[model samples]
Target: HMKNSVSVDLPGSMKVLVSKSSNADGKYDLIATVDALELSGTSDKNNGSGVLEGVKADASKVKLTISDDLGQTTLEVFKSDGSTLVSKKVTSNGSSTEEKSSNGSSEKIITRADGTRLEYTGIKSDGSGKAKEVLKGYVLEGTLTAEKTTLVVKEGTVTLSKNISKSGEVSVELNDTDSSAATKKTAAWNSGTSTLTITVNSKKTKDLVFTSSNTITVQQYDSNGTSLEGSAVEITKLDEIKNALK
Candidate 1:
């Protein structure tokens, strides 16, 4: 029944430390400590800000280690009571991925000669204590001459590597045509459901594959910050809430 949060302004190529604990008697005592959680931003500075969302803590006390890059920096931490716990200005180094010249500056633009693109469609209830969204309309064009492209999802990156000749070796990074940069995309529902569906489009013939449904659950937290409690939090449906949390 207690809540806590922390925020840290991270710089390029820096490490941030985060820890959490329980303070039952109003004294901060270590119940959990997050050894290290790395934060990073987009390589392009003109693309606005990079965000890490929905970081749920396992305890009531949280700590943040922030690194700053060259620019006006701000880190704001908030608790469930809607009060800022930590707010400060940190300096930055202004170092990031090298800038690249491109054909245009837009999200919907593509540059590769022959590649594929994935677009998000919509979100719907999965009917099994979770919600799901449909990502349809994969546009594959050009003459890359690849049989299949393996769409891999890594931490903060979605790579569509070519799996030609079934050798599982040809992997090409698809960049936005306008900016000629790697795609920066993520898909998740506002509500904490247990399932998600991802779709992929092809550039060659009529070959479409829907990712196997993925099920996620609400994060578990302790009642008194002392012992482990199973996942027992009740997350209202997206249709019921209609408002984003955090």
Candidate 2:
């Protein structure tokens, strides 16, 4: 670290960093912190003064510690097909080790040096509150680790074309919830295929039904990826199914 010999206009050059490490329990230990420089200036509100006496700056890392008890964190994630995608217990243990005083701004305004960004929901606690933390990433049959599991996209493809004997592969990346072996295809990639993903304000679950086929379940979500709550008995129905294989 070097002292600042030249004048640098320090206004908006900070960022939030999520320092994380994998834990022995198959989960990850993440320390979300922000690099901040505290400045105590002598200038009047609008007046920009010169030769600020004893210019003191608090160059420190601000650790964001959130204390939340979601009762028992028994989170079991599932795929749309009722296949158990992720089933594990949710756990949040550990607090900020560093001593923290008032961050000066009660507005909860945050700045970051890296490009990482945080979105606030406008509602804040009367006392200090924690920014939302997602401890569990993707849960499968494996034991949970303390770090993010890398999802290898083994050419995870979507339906390029489909027919009684024709098909192709569409390009896509795999999310933690996606299956690397899952290839999305259709009966025929013409007007017969228009897989529309809809979002509800609340969590909604529906199943697309075919007259001669097993029902497939569908869950609705909002723009921010939160589930919408609602029930749909028969969201979509098909008159008949010509073939059933796979």
Using lDDT, give the best candidate's number.
1
lDDT of 2 by residue, 170-242 (tens): 2112112224323232222112332223212232222122211222223333445455435433322211111
lDDT of 1 by residue, 86-110 (tens): 2222324542211111232111111
Q: At residue 166, what lDDT does model 2 achieve?
A: 11
Per the 3 Å backbone cut-off, how many clashing residue pairs does candidate 2 have? 20
lDDT of 2 at 46: 20
Model 2 scores a TM of 0.15
Name the 10 consecutive residues with the lowest summed lDDT in model 1: 202-211
RMSD to the hidden true structure, all candidates: 24.0, 22.7
